[PDB]
Design a protein around this ligand. Structure first.
Ligand SMILES: O=C(O)CNC(=O)C(=O)O
Ligand SMILES: [Mg+2]
Ligand code: NI
Ligand SMILES: [Zn+2]
Length: 331
C-alpha cells in the first residue's frame, strides 16, 4: 500500500508531465498522495500562470468579510460580518496597514505559534469566493479556468447529462485570515494556486480518518452539532494543532508559497490561515475515483450551508433518497 503513514507528498512534474492534468492526478494517486488528503505540486520552471501581477488593483471585492471569532484560542468559531466594497488596491493597502499587517517573526513556526495564540483577539478582513480567474488565456497547462467540468465527468462516468457550470474563484487574504475545518462540497477535489504574496499554512486530516475529526468536532461544538448533523459544512469551526494532538487526531501540516499548487482530495478535511496579503485561485474538480465519495457525502439540510446552483444536480443524481430533504433546506 503506497504512503501508508498518509504523509503530505510534494511533486515536481516536468514540462512534459504537466501537459495532461488527469493523467498526473492519477499518477500522484498511484504513489499514494491521496491518502494524506492534500498534495503540493511545484510547476516546472518553464511554466507561468500569467506574465505579471501589475494590473490587478482594479478588481472589485464586492463583499469583504470581517472574520470575528468566539471561543478559546485553540477551539473557536468565526462568523463573517459583511463590509463595504473595496478594490484589490484598497484591500492590499488595508492588509499592509499597522492594524492588519503581519507581525515581526523569526520563521514560519514562530508565525504559526503567534497565529494560534492570538488569532481570536483580532478580526481580519477576507475577500472570498470572488468568481473569476487570473490565469492568462494562453496558459495551456494547469489553467484552472480550463479544466474538465464536473458535470462532464458525471456524464462520462454515469451517462446522464446534467445542468450546471463549474468556474474558478479568487481569494484575497491578509494576516490571520482563516479557512475553517471542512471538506469540499459533495466531497469533491479542489485545486488551489497561490498567485502572489505571502504564504498560506494548511492543516489536513487523512480521508481514512475523517470520522475521527467529525467526532471531536461534535464534542467541542456541542450546540452546533445539535443544530446540524453536518455542521462542518457551515465552514465556521476551528481547532488548533495542539488540541488535535491532545485528542489523538491524525493530521499533517504544510505551508504553500506563491507559485505553488495544492490539491485537496475527496473527504480530506482541511483548515488554515494566510500569513499576509496574498491572492489564491481555486476550483473544484472530479475524477472517476470521486463518484463513490460523492454518493456518500454528508449533507447540511438545516438551512445554513446554502450552496451553488450546480450542487442540485449532484444531490439529485448521486443521492436521490436525500434529495427532497436537502432541497427543503435550500428553500
Ligand atoms: O485558500 C482558501 O481560503 C481556502 N482553501 C481551500 O479550502 C481549498 O482550495 O479547498
Ligand atoms: Mg485590475
Ligand atoms: Ni476547501
Ligand atoms: Zn447545517
Amino acid at each position: 500500500a503506497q504512503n501508508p503513514n498518509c504523509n503530505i507528498m510534494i511533486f515536481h512534474p516536468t514540462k512534459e508531465e504537466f501537459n495532461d492534468f488527469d493523467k498526473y492526478i492519477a499518477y500522484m494517486e498511484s504513489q499514494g498522495a491521496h491518502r494524506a488528503g492534500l498534495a503540493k505540486i511545484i510547476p516546472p520552471k518553464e511554466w507561468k500562470a500569467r506574465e505579471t501581477y501589475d494590473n490587478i488593483s482594479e478588481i472589485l471585492i464586492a463583499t469583504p468579510l470581517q472574520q470575528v471569532a468566539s471561543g478559546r484560542a485553540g477551539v473557536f468559531t468565526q462568523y463573517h460580518k459583511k463590509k463595504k466594497a473595496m478594490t484589490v488596491g484598497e484591500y492590499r493597502h488595508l492588509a499592509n496597514s499597522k492594524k492588519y499587517q503581519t507581525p515581526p517573526h523569526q520563521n514560519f513556526e514562530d508565525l504559526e505559534r503567534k497565529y494560534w495564540k492570538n488569532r481570536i483577539y483580532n478580526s481580519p478582513i477576507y475577500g472570498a469566493d470572488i468568481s473569476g480567474s487570473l490565469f492568462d488565456e494562453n496558459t495551456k497547462q494547469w489553467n484552472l479556468g480550463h479544466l474538465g467540468t464536473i458535470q462532464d465527468l458525471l456524464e462520462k462516468e454515469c451517462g446522464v447529462v446534467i445542468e450546471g457550470v463549474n468556474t474558478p474563484y479568487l481569494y484575497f487574504g491578509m494576516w490571520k485570515t482563516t479557512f475553517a475545518w471542512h471538506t469540499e462540497d459533495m466531497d469533491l477535489y479542489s485545486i488551489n494556486y497561490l498567485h502572489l504574496g505571502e504564504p498560506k499554512t494548511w492543516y489536513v486530516v487523512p480521508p481514512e480518518h475523517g470520522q475521527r475529526l467529525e467526532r471531536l468536532a461534535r464534542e467541542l461544538f456541542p450546540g452546533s452539532s445539535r443544530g446540524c448533523g453536518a455542521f462542518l459544512r457551515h465552514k465556521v469551526a476551528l481547532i488548533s494543532p495542539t488540541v488535535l494532538k491532545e485528542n489523538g487526531i491524525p493530521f499533517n501540516r504544510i505551508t504553500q508559497e506563491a507559485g505553488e499548487f495544492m490539491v485537496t482530495f475527496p473527504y480530506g478535511y482541511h483548515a488554515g490561515f494566510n500569513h499576509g496579503f496574498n491572492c489564491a485561485e481555486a476550483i473544484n474538480f472530479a475524477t472517476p475515483r470521486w463518484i463513490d465519495y460523492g454518493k456518500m457525502a454528508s449533507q447540511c439540510s438545516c438551512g445554513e450551508a446554502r450552496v451553488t446552483f450546480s450542487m442540485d444536480a449532484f444531490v439529485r443524481i448521486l443521492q436521490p433518497e436525500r434529495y427532497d430533504l436537502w432541497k427543503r433546506g435550500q428553500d
